[PDB]
Design a protein around this ligand. Structure first.
Ligand code: HEC
Length: 81
């Protein structure tokens, strides 16, 4: 949820409705709506980092995020709208 996203420092770079540095979270939910393993896929990107999906600015690995929190964040992102 938003509190967890704040606690794990996701909000420096992402808001729900609009693009900041990384993509708007609802835009992530929209893109992955039909991907079956979307939540585990996104949790993997949160833990390990991402580049090239949205631009050439990489998201660094979020080394302080626990497995359970990465999955809770991915799950929450997917519900957005
Ligand atoms: C700036 C330093 C960021 C921080 C802190 C967080 N995110 Fe990020 N994220 C950022 C960028 C620039 C990108 C695009 C990377 C790319 O491939 O072009 C992303 C991407 C994501 C994604 C999408 C990955 C995908 O394969 O589509 C997710 C799901 C995501 N970010 C989640 C996320 C979370 C939960 C964060 C807090 C732990 C977080 N990001 C921090 C920039 C930054």
């Amino acid at each position: 949820d938003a509190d967890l996203a704040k606690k794990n420092n996701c909000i420096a770079c992402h808001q729900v409705e609009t693009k900041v540095v990384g993509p708007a979270l609802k835009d992530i939910a929209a893109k992955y709506a039909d991907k079956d393993d979307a939540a585990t896929y996104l949790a993997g990107k949160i833990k390990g980092g991402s580049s090239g999906v949205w631009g050439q600015i990489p998201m660094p690995p979020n080394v302080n995020v626990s497995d359970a929190d990465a999955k809770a964040l991915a799950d929450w992102i997917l519900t957005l709208k």
